[PDB]
Automatic annotation (TrEMBL), chain C:
Keyword Kinase appears in the UniProt entry: yes
Domain Carbohydrate kinase PfkB: 16-272
Gene (UniProt): pfkB
Organism: Mycobacterium marinum (strain ATCC BAA-535 / M)
Family of this protein: Belongs to the carbohydrate kinase PfkB family.
PANTHER family: HEXOKINASE FAMILY MEMBER, PSEUDOURIDINE KINASE-RELATED
Keywords carried by this UniProt record: ATP-binding, Kinase, Nucleotide-binding, Transferase
Entry keyword Transferase: yes
Top-level taxonomic group: Bacteria
Record Pfam families: PfkB
Protein name: Fructokinase, PfkB
Gene3D superfamilies hit by this protein: 3.40.1190.20
GO molecular function, one term: ATP binding
UniProtKB/TrEMBL annotation, chain D:
Recorded superkingdom: Bacteria
Keywords noted in UniProt: ATP-binding, Kinase, Nucleotide-binding, Transferase
Keyword Nucleotide-binding: yes
MF GO annotations: ATP binding; kinase activity
Coiled-coil segments: none
PROSITE patterns to which the protein is assigned, alphabetical: PFKB_KINASES_1, PFKB_KINASES_2
Entry similarity comment: Belongs to the carbohydrate kinase PfkB family.
Organism: Mycobacterium marinum (strain ATCC BAA-535 / M)
A Pfam family hit: PfkB
Protein name: Fructokinase, PfkB
Length: 273, 279, 272, 282, 278, 271
C-alpha cells in the first residue's frame, strides 16, 4: 500500500521555506503514517539540498530523476515564480494504490504532458486524486490552463478545490455549481473548501458539509487528511473504484470532518510557534 | 370541522443489537403528526389483515387518525428491513369513500410506486377543486427507475400547492444544480410554496412574494422531516390559507407569514425530537 | 470632488409623516459620513418639500437647482400607496460628479427614468456609476419594462447593491447569487448582495467576499449603500480615472468595504 | 389451431399538407395483419372507438383475417397521429385480463409498450402469458418519442427482460445508448434473457444474435421504413413459427437456435419486408 | 455570406526532375468551397517567392480571396515524398475579417506552434457569429511531441460544430478503439456532426438524432478535402451554418445528415474523377 | 533452412470417414503452398492412424517423432472421441514459425505443454494461434477461456472467426475482442466475418477485404494463406519480430487479400 505524488517542490522566498502544494500533500500523508513516493523536479544546489533533506526527514521516498533541474524552482512574495516543470515519463514505481497531482505540475509544459500520460498509465491500478490549487501569478496563458484542469477533472476519482480555485475556473457560476459540474464528468468525490464558511463535498449519494472552524499549506493538509481518511475507509486502489463512487453521505461527512480537523490542527500547531 | 386526507404508505420498519419493529411510513407520520396537533385527519393506505396490519391500525386509531375504508386489502403489510431492503405493495382504490377534504397530502413511495402512484396522481387532480394539495417527495434511497421516479415527482409538482423537500431529495432529483435552483424551478410550475430543509443549516421556503429563511436548531432525519411537514401544514391551516377557496390567498402568502410558518414547522420538528429523546 | 445622487425624495405616511426616498437616504448617509454630495430629485413648493429641503440642508446635502418644480411633493402611504410623479431636466446644473448614484423608483418610473439612463451614460466619463435596484412594485407599471430598464442600468453601472428580495422579484427562477454573478459579467466592477440575517456577499473579478449578519428595512439598506460608497471613496477607487483600479479590487479590499457597509447600516439602526 | 396474440395500438395516420389523407396505422396492428396475411390465426387486443375511424379500422382488421379481441372498442375516440410537426390524439388503456385462450405467441411494441396506463397491463400480460407463449417485442422508438418527447429508457429495458424475441432498428438502439454502436446494445439485450435479438440496419441489411452466434443478411438493392419494419417482424415470427420454435414448449429449442436456422429466419424476414414494399409499388 | 478558412497552403513536391503542385488541406477546402459557388476568404502563411506567387495565382484563379497578412512567411512551406516538411505556420491572432458564417481549420494549422495558438484565438473570437468546422487530417511525419499534438486536436474538437475525420486519423488519435467510438466520443464534447470516412467502406456520421451512412462509391490526393467542402457546401444550402442556426444544426435529422454525406461522397468522387482525367 | 512447426490435433471426421483436425489442415495448407513443415500431433497405430500418417506424407509435411503414440487415433463423427498429450520437449530444431490452436490449446493433458513450448520457441520463432472454438468437446469453459487468453499473450499472429470470439465473449462485438487481444502482445489479429469478408488489426491501423462471391477447411486454408504470405513478405522468425509488429496497413491488406483468395481458391478447386 504505497501512494505516488507527482508535482512541484520549491522554496517560498517571502527568509526562505520549503513548499510546493504537491510536496505538502506528500509530507502530509507521510506525517499521518502512509508510504509515499514523491517524484519532483529540484536542483542539486543549496535550495535543492534543503528540499531533499526536508523530504528525507519526513519519511517520503524521493523517486529517481527528481534532482535533474538546472536550478531549484522558487516562489518570491501576489507571488513571482522562477520555475521549470519537467519529469521523466517512464513509470518509476510499482503501481501505487493512489496517484495524486495538481498545482503547477498538472498545467505547465513540458511536465504537464508526462503527468497526464503517467495518470493515464497508473489509473487501472490507482485512485487518481487532484487539487486545482490555481497559482495565477505563474507565467502561462489562462485558456490552456483552464482546459488542462478540465481534462484532469475528467480523469480523476477524488478532487479537492477552494472556492477561489473554482471562481478562477468560471466566475459566472457559484463554486458549488462548478463542483457539481465536475462530479458529473466522472469523479467519485468533489470536495470544496469555503474558507470561514467550512467545506462541502459531493458524491452520487448526496451533498456533505462541515461548518466553519488564511495561512500557507492549510489546503494541502486538508487534502492529505482527506486522502488519509479515504485510505483508512478502504476506498482507494482501482480495485475499490466502484465502492469509492458509492461512498455514503455519512462516510463522506466523516472524511470531510477529518480533513477539516487535520487542516485546522496543522494551522494551530504552526500558529503556536 | 374541516378534515385533512393523507394518501400514502404505512409500514413496519424492521431494524436488524436488539432487533425491533416500529410503525412508520412518512405519510403515516404526517397523518399522525397532524392529529397530535389537534387536526381531524383521514389516512388512505395499503396494509394487510395480519399482526403488523392490526398494529398500524391500532397506532393510527390511538393517535386520533381515521383509517379510510379500502386501506386493509394488501396480501401482506409492507415492511422495510435495515442494505435497506423492502417488502412492499402500493395499491389504492381509484375512488375512495372520502367527502371533499380541505387538504390532500401525498408523496414518499406512494407517489412513485406502481400501480398506486397512478391513482395518487388522478386523486390529487380530483381533490384540488376542494383541497389544498401538499407533497413531500422524500426519496427513500433504495428506490428504482430513477428517471421514471423523476418524471412522476415532476407531475406531482405541477398538481401541488405546497411542497416540502430536503437538500438530499433535490440532489437526487438533479445532482447538477444546487437544491435552491430545483426548488425555485418547482415554484415556477404552479405551487404557492416550496419549502426546502437544509439539515443543520435550518430551512428555506420560496413563494411569489419572496424567499424566507430560518436558522438551524441545536433523531431520525425523516421522522424529524415528517414532523416538520405536519407543523408546516398545521400552521398554514391556522393562518387560514388551506382549502381551494383560499388557494389565491395561499399563493399570495407574505414573506413574514411564510417565515412564521417555517419557524413553527422548525420548532414543531425540534420539539417532536426533544420529547422523544427524553422517553 | 463631489458625489451626485439622482432620484426620489418623499414623505413616508404610516397607516392611520416621515422624510423618505431611497436615493435621498443614500445622499444624507454620504453627507453624514462627511462627503460633499448633491441630490437632484423632484419635490413640491409646498409643506412636505420644505421639510425635505431643511432635512437635506441639516444633513449637509446640497439640493440641485431644478428639483423643486414639482406639481405635488410625492407621497408613500403604508403595503404601500404611491402618490408620485418622477420628472427631471434633460440636463442638470452640476459638474461631472466623481460618483453618480441612482436607483429605486427613479430608475423605472416615467418620464424621469428616461433622462436617468441618458445621464448615467454621459456621467461615466468622469464619475463612478452606482445603482441600487431597491424594487418597489406597489407603484405599478409594465413589469417587463421595469425589468428592461433595470437591466440597461446594470450595463452602465460600476457598483450594484441589491437585496435577495430585489433579485427574487427581478428573476424568481434563479437564486439571487446567480442573478448577481450574471450582472457582474455585464460590466460592473462590484455587485453587492444583502441576504438579511445571513449577512452580505459581493462579487468582483478577483473573487467573492462575504460578511456574516448582526453586524428600518429600507433605511438599513440605504445606509449599507452609503457606507459601501464611502469606504470605496476612502480606498481611492471612485472616479473615471480609478475605474480600472475598482474593477481590479482585491477580495480583501472588497471584504473590508462589505464590513464597513454592514457596520455602518447596523450602527445607523442602533443609533435610532 | 394454435393462435398468436398481438397487443398494441391501432390508429389513423393523418397526413396534413399537399393532397392530405387518412391511413390505417399502428405498428402492432401492422404485425397482426402481416401475420394473418402469411396464413396465421391472430387475435389483436387494441384500443379503438365506436366512431367512424373505429369502424374503418375494425373493417380493415376483419378483411385481413385478424380477430379483434373483445374489449378493444371502448375508446372515447379512435386514436390518431397527425403529420403536419407530429401531433398525437391517443389514449392507451386495456382490460387487465382479456378474454383470450393461452396463445402460442404474444407480440407487443411501440406506444402500447410505453404509454400509461395501458403499458402497465401490457407488462403484466407478458409475465402471465409467458408460461404458455413465446414473447416477442419491437421497441419501435421513433413514434413513441414523437408522442412522449420525455420518454424514459427504463420502460423499454423492463420489456427486454420479459422477451424471447426482440427486433429493433439501429435508430431504436442509438436512442437507448448513443455512446455505443447498436450491436453493443443488441448483445447487452441478448445477455438479459432473450433467445434472439434482431437488429435492422436500413440499407445495410440486418443482423441477429443468439447464444450460438451472430447471423447477418445484406441490404436489398431498393421508403416506408415504419411500414417495412412491421412486415420484417411479421416475417421473422411466421418463419420461427414454421421452424417449430414458438410456444413455451419450445422455448429451450428457441434459445438453442443455430446460426444457420437464425440466418434463414433473417433472410425470410428481409425478403418478406422487401416483397411487402415491392407489392405496394403497384 | 462569407466562409473563412484558416490553414496551411504549401507545395507538394513529388519524389523522383520531379514536379511541384499547389497543396495544403485547408487550401483545398477553400478552393473546393469556392468552386461550388461560395464566397471564401483564406488566411494562410506563404512567402513572396516563386512558390508563393504560384499559390497566390492558384487561389486567385479558384475564386478564393486571400486574407491580408497571409504572405509574411520567410519562405513558402514545402512537403516532399511518408512526407518531409520544410514548414513554418505563424499567423496574426487579430480578427482580419467581418464575422463569417463559417470558420474552418484543420491539419497542420491546428497542431503546429506558433500559428495554432492564433487559430484557437480566432475560432474563440468568431464562434458567436460563425459555425466552426474542423478536419484533424493528421500528418504525423511533421516532427512534433505527439501528446502536444493530441491535446491541440482535443481543444479544437471542444470548439467545433462540424468535424470530419478519416478512420486513419482516429486510429492515430487513439489506436485502442474502433474509429466509430472515437467519433461518438467526439460528438459528446459539443459538436453537432462528427463525420467519419472509412475509405472503400463508404462514410458514416453522428449527430444527436442518430447515425447516418453512405455506401462505397464505385471509382487519391485531396479526396478528403473535397469531401469536407462538399459536406460544408450542402450544410450551407440546408440553412444550418451561422451561430444563429447552431441550435438547428444540432437538431439536424438523420435524413438531412444522410443527404449531406451523399453530396459529400459524390463531391469527393467527382474531384478524383476530374483529376484522373487531367 | 527455415522450417515451420504446427502443434495440435489430427483426427478422423466421420459423416464416410475424412482426415481432419484444424492444425493438421494449416500444416497441410502450408506444405501445399511449398513451405517445409513439421507436425507434432497425437495419432494411433491403426487403419485410421496410418490413413492420417499417409495423408501427412503425401502432402509433404513431416511427422514430429513421438506423434504416433496414441492408443487409438482420435475421432469426430460433433461427438469427440480423442486424447491430447505431447512430450514436454519435441525432437525439433528451432523453427521459424510455431502454430497451434483448436483442441490442442485447450484439452488436457498436453494443453499444459503447449503453453510452455510457445514461450520456449519464441526466441527463434514467430508464434501463431487460431482458437477455432469447438465446445462440443465438453470441458470447464472458464479454464478453456483462461488457456485461450494465456496463448493470446504469447502469440505474434492471431486469427479467429466471429463465431470463435462470440463464444469467448458474447457481450462484445468481435472487433472489440480482437482489438483487446492485440493489446496483450500480438503484432496482428485477423478476424474472418463470414460473408462480410475479413479484417485485421496491427499497430499501424486496420485492414479489410470484402466478402468473396464451404467447410471450416476454409478457415484453416485462410490461416495457411496468411502465414504463407507473411513468410514471403520476410516477416517470420524472432529476428523479424519488430518488422512484423510494424507491418504497414498496405502490407497487412495484401496479406488479408492473399489469405481470403487462398481460402476462396481452396474451396472452389475442391467443387
Amino acid at each position: 500500500a504505497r501512494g505516488l505524488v507527482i508535482g512541484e517542490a520549491l522554496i517560498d522566498i517571502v527568509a526562505e521555506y520549503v513548499g510546493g502544494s504537491p510536496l505538502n500533500v506528500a509530507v502530509g500523508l507521510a506525517r499521518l503514517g502512509r508510504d509515499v513516493d514523491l517524484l519532483t523536479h529540484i536542483g542539486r544546489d543549496a535550495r535543492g539540498r534543503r528540499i531533499a533533506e526536508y523530504i528525507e526527514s519526513s519519511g517520503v521516498q524521493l523517486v529517481s530523476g527528481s534532482q535533474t533541474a538546472d536550478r531549484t524552482p522558487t516562489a518570491t512574495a501576489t507571488y513571482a515564480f522562477d520555475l521549470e516543470w519537467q519529469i521523466p515519463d517512464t513509470p518509476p514505481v510499482a503501481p501505487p494504490l493512489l496517484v495524486h497531482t495538481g498545482s503547477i505540475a498538472a498545467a505547465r509544459e513540458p511536465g504537464c504532458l508526462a503527468v497526464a500520460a503517467l495518470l493515464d498509465a497508473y489509473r487501472a491500478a490507482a485512485t487518481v486524486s487532484f487539487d486545482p490549487n490555481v497559482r495565477p501569478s505563474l507565467s502561462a496563458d489562462p485558456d490552456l490552463t483552464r482546459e488542462r484542469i478540465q481534462r484532469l477533472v475528467e480523469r480523476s476519482d477524488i478532487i479537492k478545490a477552494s472556492a477561489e480555485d473554482l471562481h478562477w475556473i468560471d466566475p459566472t457560476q457559484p463554486p458549488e455549481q462548478t463542483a457539481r459540474a465536475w462530479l458529473a464528468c466522472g469523479p467519485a468525490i468533489v470536495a470544496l473548501t469555503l474558507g470561514d464558511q467550512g467545506a462541502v463535498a459531493f458524491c452520487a449519494a448526496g451533498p456533505a458539509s462541515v461548518p466553519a472552524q488564511d495561512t500557507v499549506g492549510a489546503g494541502d493538509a486538508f487534502m492529505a487528511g482527506l486522502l488519509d481518511t479515504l485510505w483508512e475507509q478502504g476506498l482507494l486502489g482501482a480495485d475499490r473504484r466502484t465502492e469509492l463512487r458509492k461512498i455514503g453521505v455519512s462516510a463522506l461527512t466523516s472524511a470531510l470532518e477529518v480533513a477539516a480537523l487535520t487542516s485546522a490542527l496543522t494551522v494551530a500547531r504552526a500558529g503556536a510557534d
